[PDB]
Design a protein around this ligand. Sequence first.
Ligand SMILES: [Mg+2]
Ligand SMILES: [Mg+2]
Lengths: 406, 409
Amino acid sequence: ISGGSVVEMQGDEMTRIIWELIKEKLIFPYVELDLHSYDLGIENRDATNDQVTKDAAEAIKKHNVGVKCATITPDEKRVEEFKLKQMWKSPNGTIRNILGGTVFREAIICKNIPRLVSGWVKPIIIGRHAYGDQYRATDFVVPGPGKVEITYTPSDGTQKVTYLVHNFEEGGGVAMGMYNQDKSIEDFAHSSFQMALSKGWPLYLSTKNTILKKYDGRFKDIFQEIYDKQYKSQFEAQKIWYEHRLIDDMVAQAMKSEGGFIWACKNYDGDVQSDSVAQGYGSLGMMTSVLVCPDGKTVEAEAAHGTVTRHYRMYQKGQETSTNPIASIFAWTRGLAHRAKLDNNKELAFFANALEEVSIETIEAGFMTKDLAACIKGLPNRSDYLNTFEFMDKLGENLKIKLAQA
Amino acid sequence: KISGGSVVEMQGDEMTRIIWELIKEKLIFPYVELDLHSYDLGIENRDATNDQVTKDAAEAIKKHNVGVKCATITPDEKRVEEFKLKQMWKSPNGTIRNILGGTVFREAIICKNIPRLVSGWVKPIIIGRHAYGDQYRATDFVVPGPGKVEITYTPSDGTQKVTYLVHNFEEGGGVAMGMYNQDKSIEDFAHSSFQMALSKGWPLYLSTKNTILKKYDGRFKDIFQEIYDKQYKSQFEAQKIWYEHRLIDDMVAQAMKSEGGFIWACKNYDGDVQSDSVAQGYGSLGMMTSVLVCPDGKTVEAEAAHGTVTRHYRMYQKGQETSTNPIASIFAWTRGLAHRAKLDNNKELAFFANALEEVSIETIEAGFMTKDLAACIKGLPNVQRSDYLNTFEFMDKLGENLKIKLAQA
Ligand SMILES: [Mg+2]
Ligand SMILES: [Mg+2]
């Protein structure tokens, strides 16, 4: 299959290893691609002073489809490990801040994988605003007594306003400024309403506008305006609704619901609650994560659950590993699925969906990695699972079998 | 009657205000005479006093050491129109908490017969919510158009002014905000967290996002680790427990799959969010205690961790039957009275407070409960009217069982 142009972002440690096997055994044997590869490995980002992160983001803007491997965001320990020049910032934040949009996250559900939350019989889709707030903030330590202020200087000559954040009288502490943008919020709202109409489900927006009356009130107002002016009639035609809820009420409503709704989250809440939801369905790694940009055509699919450092340690030590590749697989299929839509590549669309089916049916047939065997029988309880290479070998077979019968 | 002593009462709003009176009339006043210092924190009285009554109540809590608070309305624009308010008043919980300081400890109220929504939580989860700063003392504003937003720090000793660019709005407007926290408050927060873990014999976890907020959240992580290494590590090892810092998103996942049995120190915002998640995970927002424990070790503010339950209130004012779980509000009283008794060595009052808590749990375990807990047993689509009691019917049964239990003692 002539898949077309796709931007690839290589990753780190075990996810890097799986990334290549995904390419060699599941994608390349059936799809020919005009790949634009950017190596976002921790060592290459350091070598390029993180410019490669900036380059890849622009390439996605240029070619409209990116697929990203899990990467390391370095901490103190990692700076020493790789002797890094700086503690480089999260490349996910960099890419999202450049492209903007909404990261849609949803569990990857298998019949035989137990949930931790009893009632979630329908999926929950979180729309995480991908821009601003804590992820582009300016925080600093306050070393001692002093005055912390935040000021806004209008460009049209209107008066500068100054607000007291806090007067530190006896000691120091911490302070920080953050922001968000009307246009970004408007895109976030449009993406949320359109996702609800596509799935035929109600939409909920969570904020804390009772406490952040101006900051979070802006989110509430923009959503309600766009709803009243542009979507209410469409929602009523489909027998769905939109509601704003305070964040603490919303997570409780989600916990007790049956699923089957779209959940628009501010950036920070989307990060936190998407991991809570993913784990609630059975496994934190069984999740899709696709950034949908405002233009409606540009997309970045990713594996969101970081690397598997302990698996990498054994892999290079020669010890057998059993690492779950599903999320990395679904970053590809979701990217290829979008590639097909942009190009009307019906052949690629079938392949993308076929591979997702093969992954689910393979696991639902009892062939799975150690991660899922523990979910079923509990970690304390080799014959129950397949090692990394053995599992991917099986997916290759069922994919070739499934594709042949066509 | 039992001589209860001095207690600061804060009256509330909507459904919790209605329940608040039933608790006093049916469960407290018939058995306890109190020197109550009542402050009406109803939205309309706060507006009339320009929110001064909220500040007065906070200082009264400092004076009498025991406060019990009904849920209140924090108004937004819609609430200003509803009540024709002078201003969009700030959360009185934030005002009280910022004045007194300390840690809000929240935990589910567990009944044998109530199924959970989270499978593994066989041990309790206790959240220690930092009660000071962050979003609850922030300075936010709308950015009407293009312009430059900066945040600056001016030392009081005349040293260099430090200026940071927050963002330059080039096309259109948006929102901006400043936030802060204080070393001493974090230090108190850490001490209260380590001491709670040692008291319960459980490990402690602190959740932050220091990978993104390297300075802001890193300060929390560093202060906790310093105080731990210098003052608590040895005690933790003696009891076979531990302390570790975790990323917030990692932590909520860890908690979801855990079996419980740990202390969870949360920044102010995270404590609010996750306390509702945890309470619902164990079964119901109404089955949770919430007590602000101040640094002095003597002052206390007991509350119900949930809101004023507006949606239930709308039906009540329509004259319709409602079924709102009052246990959390009841336990705000018992927890406050229990602390009042401890400070006063009031063995009779201490017995009463504990007796009512036992009656609350025993009544539910005997099959008498509100609709929320009935749904926990039989999926909400399957609940029938015969499976639960309305709010007043439930309180009547607690009154009867309380009368019985107190007689037999
Ligand atoms: Mg995350
Ligand atoms: Mg709350």
